Amino acid sequence: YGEKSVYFDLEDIGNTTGQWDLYGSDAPSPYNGLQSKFFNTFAAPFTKRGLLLKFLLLGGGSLLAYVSASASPDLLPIKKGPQLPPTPGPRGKI
Amino acid sequence: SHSVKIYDTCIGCTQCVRACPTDVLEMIPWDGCKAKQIASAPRTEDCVGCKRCESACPTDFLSVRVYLGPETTRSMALSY
Amino acid sequence: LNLPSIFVPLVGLVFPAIAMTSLFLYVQKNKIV
Amino acid sequence: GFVPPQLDPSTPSPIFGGSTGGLLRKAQVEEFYVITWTSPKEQVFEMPTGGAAIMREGPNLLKLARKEQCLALGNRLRSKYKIAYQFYRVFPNGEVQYLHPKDGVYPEKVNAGRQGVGQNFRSIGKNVSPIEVKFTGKNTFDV
Amino acid sequence: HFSRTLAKGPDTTTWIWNLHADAHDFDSHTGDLEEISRKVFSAHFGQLSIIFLWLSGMYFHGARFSNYEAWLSDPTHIGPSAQVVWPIVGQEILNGDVGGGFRGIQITSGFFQLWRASGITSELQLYCTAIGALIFAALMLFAGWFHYHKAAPKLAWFQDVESMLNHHLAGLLGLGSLSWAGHQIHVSLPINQFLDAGVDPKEIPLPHEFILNRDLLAQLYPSFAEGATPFFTLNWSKYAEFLTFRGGLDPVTGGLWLTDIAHHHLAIAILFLIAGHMYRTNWGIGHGLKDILEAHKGPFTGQGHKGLYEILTTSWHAQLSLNLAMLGSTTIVVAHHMYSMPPYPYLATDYGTQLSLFTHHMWIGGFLIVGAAAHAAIFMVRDYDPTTRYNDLLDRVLRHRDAIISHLNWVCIFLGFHSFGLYIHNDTMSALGRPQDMFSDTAIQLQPIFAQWVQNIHATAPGVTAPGATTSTSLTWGGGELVAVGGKVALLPIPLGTADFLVHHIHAFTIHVTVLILLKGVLFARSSRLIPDKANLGFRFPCDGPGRGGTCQVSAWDHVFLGLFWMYNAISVVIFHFSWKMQSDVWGTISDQGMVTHITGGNFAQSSITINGWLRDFLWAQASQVIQSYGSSLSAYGLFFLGAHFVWAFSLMFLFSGRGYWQELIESIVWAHNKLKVAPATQPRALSIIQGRAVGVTHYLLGGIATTWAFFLARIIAVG
Amino acid sequence: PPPIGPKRGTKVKILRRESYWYNGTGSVVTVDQDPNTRYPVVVRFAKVNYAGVSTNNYALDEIKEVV
Amino acid sequence: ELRFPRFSQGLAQDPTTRRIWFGIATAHDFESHDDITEERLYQNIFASHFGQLAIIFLWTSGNLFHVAWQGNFESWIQDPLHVRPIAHAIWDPHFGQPAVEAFTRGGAAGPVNIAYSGVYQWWYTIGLRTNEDLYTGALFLLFLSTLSLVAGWLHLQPKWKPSLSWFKNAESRLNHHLSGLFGVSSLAWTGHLVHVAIPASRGEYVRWNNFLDVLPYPQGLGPLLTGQWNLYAQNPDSSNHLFGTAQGAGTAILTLLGGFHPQTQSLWLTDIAHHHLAIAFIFLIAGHMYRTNFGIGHSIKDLLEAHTPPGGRLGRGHKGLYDTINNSIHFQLGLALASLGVITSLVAQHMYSLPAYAFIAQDFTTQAALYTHHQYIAGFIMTGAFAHGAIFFIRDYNPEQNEDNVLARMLDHKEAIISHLSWASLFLGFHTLGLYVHNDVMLAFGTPEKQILIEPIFAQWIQSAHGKTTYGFDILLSSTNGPAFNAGRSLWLPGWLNAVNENSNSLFLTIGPGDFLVHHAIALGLHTTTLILVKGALDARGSKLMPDKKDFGYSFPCDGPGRGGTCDISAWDAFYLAVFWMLNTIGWVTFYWHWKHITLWQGNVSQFNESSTYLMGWLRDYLWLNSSQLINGYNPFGMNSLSVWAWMFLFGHLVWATGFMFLISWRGYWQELIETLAWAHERTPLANLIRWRDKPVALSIVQARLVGLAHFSVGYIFTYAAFLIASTSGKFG
Amino acid sequence: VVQPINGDPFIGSLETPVTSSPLVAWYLSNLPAYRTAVSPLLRGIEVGLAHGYLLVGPFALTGPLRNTPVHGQAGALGAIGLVTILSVVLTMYGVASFEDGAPSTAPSLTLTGRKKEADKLQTAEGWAQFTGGFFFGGVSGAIWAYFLLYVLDLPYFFK
Ligand code: SF4
Ligand code: SF4
């Protein structure tokens, strides 16, 4: 592959089909050691996907429900309720 | 894959074979007509279902029939 | 306790989220027998 | 009989500037196709993916994403020019399947040795009603 | 054409349709470029003859069945009328009281203003013009016969583009502009000055007297007393009386100053005379178009523009596509500039004429642009040949068509969201009782600051960047000046707010989508990933079968089919915007104390930011005139309104269905006719797929456009 | 041996259900004498079918002689 | 059974997004599933039916519970003509304060919706009085829904799965459903009316805790046993009776009065009880016709084989029809759908003219809503009947077993049937449209006296024969002396004649030329829709263009561009085309009903009578005139309680327009665009790390037709619902 | 300056200044997503920090409570809610796309053809670690932006 205008090679299909890494970098970690140690320690319990999905869904639903049920009336008009006498209906309807 | 069938009213004119865009059909020897040949469909895994072959057939009713079936990457003509 | 303030978010937001997640995971499975 | 030709991987490709209509991830993961031919001289032709290319004198090898593209280009080569061609299917593991022309003779020309597939020896009006194949898993045309 | 079309399909009715569909597709009849060119030349002469006949009709109807003479004496309180109907089955109710002791149909073509600007004062002059136009139509017909059946030119004559450009630039446009400037200086200017001085039209001197008596013309402009001496002595300032650079509008007639127009046409004539000496024909001086094109290379490897001369010299369709695009764009620009800077006297206060002219020329421009797309696609299918006529730039475009189309698709989606979703946001907020959360002037503001900056620059231009101009080019820019004629507003500064921002981005969205459809049709006319050999199927074919998932409407013709709908959508929104904005903020009546009352009282700013506002305050409110017209002179508009709704509804039967159903039904109907022995000699067939699409789109566009036509005319005649 | 099928120019009625000219009338052009030919009778019709063809091949038991 | 959908390996192996869409679309077509058998088909259908019953019970339980919890049923009972019933409360956090103020109605403490389904009047008429009754009903219906789910699970297990022979027992099912499902249910409802609802209409509160200690009649069962049945009718409620009270109350429980209750403007409950008693006994008699296992009864097969004319033009008659019906489920579904659609239209026609619920005639919005709702449902059911008939012809019909019977002959002369339907449609369309256009031209030229105004004299004669005296005719029941008049002179004439001669109601409304024109328009719609559906059904097996259509199934895209082109050639496509005509016909019907009634209710019938004879009259005086209050639901100056209906009006217009995109543009354009999008995604940095697992493709041809039709229908329904409700309720509440 | 990608004319891509400029290559290679040899958790931390920090502004300044003395808290809470939704969707994509124990699906070739270690991001465990880092960083960045804007009250052009 890549010799005398040849782009096909059965011994290297990855090159022939263009399965490259255009921008991937092989450089080592640029982050400081202590910073990485702190983040590895404190972000560990969130790295389990099966537990994370259930935790996110349940906790988020609970938090949303709690926020909705505890909203101040001055912030949410639907909580404040009507403040004016009702408008009359047509032909005497109430 | 789609299904393609040839019926014995074929007159062996070869037009359906020429019309196919994916080389599904071919001609084989026969003794049932004056032309002494009949169409065949050995490569239906490459058939896309365009029905050009039916458009090319001169008999009434048709001697080549295409029945659309389960869809695949080849039948849907996907290049990605 | 205002029941609508709790139930409307659950039926409009949380339950659709759970149902859509479960249906997506069910239709993405490569092996269901 | 007929011995299918072997695919030579050291065959040059036509001179082309590139385009956005070439191969995609399907060639990497599923399959692609290769068409080869021999040209008497160097000359301009139309790519099936858009744009124009220059075919070299001698052997030419071209990579494409679908069999339909290969057959369209081959028909153009046979009709406009007078060039014999053949194309193959290539799999990600490297195995090669020779495709066309299948037995060295074009399908539209009758040739001995071909076995019939999908032939019903009756007129099309003799197919049964669907009720006769209900719950049986067959087709009224599958005989 | 008739013989071959009949021989193709003699046994079925289909051939009949083909006979009409392929009448003028000359390239399909023969492959010889010379014969095609000769046919095109003769057909062009035929079109010119038809146009001359139409002009003759207009002038004759103005001379015989019009109140032009009465209107000339009182333009403000008399409505133009040039069509009268016979008293049959009660249709004489259409002869309404237009004014000046005349009953007829009021016209909105603006011919009275044009004739007044030309200086025509009597019916005899209109008769003479009609007779001359008839003579010219006959001459065009004879020339069309002669240059095809007797004296057809050769192919090398047609391919002389240098000479054609020189003659058409210096002879057609330059000399035409100069001769019209002569007419305006010597005929239209004094006649219009006398008319503006309140002189009886039958007492105004005849135009030729102004040529045979210098003393008569010197009383209006003293410079004419010196004759042609200042011109030869280069003391041109003496002609400053009738060659001005004022700007603005004439306060008496509401149009542009005629002296400005004469000076403009003189300058244009000089410019085109200079431009017409660029290309080399026979004397070894001038440029070569091929050399100019081949001299523009680029850093992107080889030179790109090389080879375009051969393509544009050997393909009629490429020339037609490019010329259609340019001419359509010119028509749209004409509409804008004619509304904003009214060139005819008493045109600005004739609201019906202004609305009609703007809308009509917008429609013409849109149709022409779509035609440009269609013939570009036809060139791609039929004349493109890289092995014989190669061009680099076209090849590169074809090699990144995918990137082009993907970027255009994204920009269309972005524009659609961030423009129409703002209207939807406004509707939702208003319905929810939250007006403080809307996108409006009294809420979250989206000001078109760049347009306002341009308006301010053009309003403050006189005296700084254009010292020689008395006022700005238009009263729309600003300056705080209002021009009123006969108690009606002609023009005044046009404010721009949040609603204008929203609607302009609507226009951008619709235009980008129409471009997406047409350009996709062009760039994939020959092939695609789905259909590798689409060029062999042709320009106009219904599909390539139900395979590959289904391939309906892949041809470039079907792209033109869809682009027509999107063009209709875009232009309809444009003309609705114009109508509502002009009625709300410009047109109106001014009292003796300077109080301005607009037709709809300035409701555009607050009502046009929601879809419900357009539904209620534009459609529902302004349809009152058309739906209440029965029993009056405008009842024909109500009848046409209903009929156009009917035609539009009828088109959906063709657009929604398919031909297999109709052929199967025709089978039973044919059985019924056979049983009674009344069978037709020609076998009936259902319309082809392509013909079904064509019929559907034609009746859809006709119904919609005619509906809007009746609505606009009824509203503006009854209220403006 | 005598030739099989009707003579040239004979008027026949079509009995094939899926034929465009079913229960119609055609004229015999020629009959193939090869015993292996499954549809030897060539029939021509006045009206073309949906595909533009006006001739077809039929078996002996798919046609009926009419006068 | 590898991945979704599990019931189809052809779809499960599909690598595109199509696999998902069709997976949803084919889920309930059991006959097409892999390795399906007849017994499994019947069992799955049984379980699905139990599911449908469970859903229905849950729906009605929810309605009852929300009315009890958030409604004002008790206040509405006290003031029926002035209190607006409440459907349910509103809790929407997107609301602004003005919306909260505007939607607070009916005495509630917060924003609510006003009910238009008529449940208040219905439940009040059948004896419900308090919130506790509604709560008990809701709980009982919830229990019934749970029981339905349990039974659906139970009859699917191996122990309790019925066999095919049980499912194919027609005689026993017919006997049980006639005697038990209809007769016994009607008898039980008569018992409810006598024991509970009628006492409730007189101030007597009878519940489960005292119904054994309260006599429905003062003399109990004495008159029934002694044979003096007339004693159950001698003291009916007087003309000054107040419905909820004992003032003027009688004691009769079965009568033959006729006419309307003067206060509630609805039918007497006593007449309803007697009617249901008679119907119950008629069905009980009818339910003993067929032999199951006791040696007495008729055989359906024998009856079908017997009816064969000796020399008439019918061939073998009804021979073999029993097997065809009993072996084809699609035939049974077609017959059932046809009957149910007819019944739905009859219900719509009779409930507006002969109301049975107290105070519902005065609730104009409810009347209009109910009529429009049930007529649209009936139209959809009518289309479905013919769809499943065509399906029967494709999948189940066997010519050999149906030789020379009625089905074979119907297939044999399909051309004549189609030709005659086509002629009828052409005649109706030509002459009706011509009359309308002639009248429009006469109005345009200012000569309204030259209109062609044809009186509907046959319908006027029928109205006169039923007792109406508006037109001055002297046909039966309107003349002083007559045999038919004298026979029923004392039976029911005193009430019926008074009812028909009071024009305040909707009983035999006065009609004129506009009624004639619009009725012939409705006839055109019926005949043309029938033409489309019948042509689809009879050509479903094949035609000259496609003689082998039965081998391709009920629904397929086309047969390609050959033979001249074959778009929309399948029977499914005929159903698709017929839905548009059904919508158009029902639109005409409901426009007519609503305009006539809205002009009657305002006291301005001259408006309809004068404007309905030309089309501009319909456009201006019905649509444009009645849209003003609706379109002012919100505007730059504020909003009111109609804002939701204005928003829904615009929403319907938008969905209707969106359907046009799918209907007009077709697939190949979109597929070509999607390929470009796929390239773009694969080439974009930071986004090509994300990969689709189902390859994106454009929607299929048939899928596009279905989606476009769905958007069209939803937009149609929502737009007209918004207009109807807003226009009626803005004027009347 | 426009060439076929990596010199192959028949791969469906092109090299342009937009795609192949050395500055563009350096910038893209120094982003967290393309640090193929670094731990997925830390790259997820960086991505989450950035996006959670940037999400505060729109919610705080455009929301329904923008004209209320609690607008900053509302904006921060909205940003946290959006971060939670995005984390759920990331977990869904990871569960659907990657089996447990399957090898990495990332390319193992450089532009010059040199073989490399496949990126561990394209695995079940790697994607889960990246998602956990993203959630933690998003919450932390939202809190940090809120602290800078509405606790210290630093001078900003609009707040
Ligand atoms: S349908 Fe198209 S691809 Fe299939 S056999 Fe016929 S011509 Fe070939
Ligand atoms: S529906 Fe019509 S246009 Fe579409 S593939 Fe079928 S025949 Fe062609």
Coordinates of N, CA and C and ligand atoms in Angstrom, one line a residue, chain B residues 4 19-22 24-25 47-53 66, ligand 1:
Chain B
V4 N -37.4 -13.6 -7.7 CA -37.5 -13.4 -9.1 C -37.8 -14.8 -9.7
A19 N -31.4 -5.6 -19.4 CA -31.9 -4.5 -18.7 C -31.5 -4.5 -17.2
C20 N -31.0 -5.6 -16.7 CA -30.8 -5.6 -15.2 C -29.6 -4.8 -14.8
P21 N -29.7 -4.0 -13.8 CA -28.6 -3.1 -13.3 C -27.6 -3.8 -12.3
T22 N -27.9 -5.0 -11.9 CA -27.0 -5.6 -10.9 C -26.6 -7.1 -11.3
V24 N -28.5 -10.0 -12.2 CA -29.2 -11.0 -11.5 C -29.5 -12.2 -12.4
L25 N -29.8 -11.9 -13.6 CA -30.3 -12.9 -14.6 C -29.3 -13.4 -15.6
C47 N -30.5 -8.5 -6.2 CA -31.6 -7.9 -6.8 C -32.0 -6.7 -6.0
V48 N -32.2 -5.5 -6.6 CA -32.7 -4.3 -5.9 C -34.2 -4.1 -6.0
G49 N -34.8 -4.8 -7.0 CA -36.3 -4.7 -7.2 C -36.7 -3.5 -8.1
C50 N -35.8 -3.1 -9.0 CA -36.1 -2.0 -9.9 C -37.3 -2.3 -10.9
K51 N -37.4 -3.6 -11.2 CA -38.4 -4.0 -12.2 C -38.2 -3.5 -13.6
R52 N -37.0 -3.2 -14.0 CA -36.6 -3.0 -15.4 C -36.9 -4.2 -16.2
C53 N -36.6 -5.4 -15.6 CA -36.8 -6.6 -16.4 C -38.2 -6.8 -16.8
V66 N -41.2 -10.2 -10.4 CA -40.4 -9.8 -9.3 C -41.3 -9.6 -8.1
Ligands
SF4_1 S1 -36.0 -6.2 -10.5 FE1 -34.2 -5.0 -11.3 S2 -32.4 -5.9 -10.1 FE2 -34.1 -7.4 -9.8 S3 -33.8 -8.9 -11.5 FE3 -35.3 -7.3 -12.3 S4 -33.9 -5.8 -13.4 FE4 -32.5 -7.1 -12.1

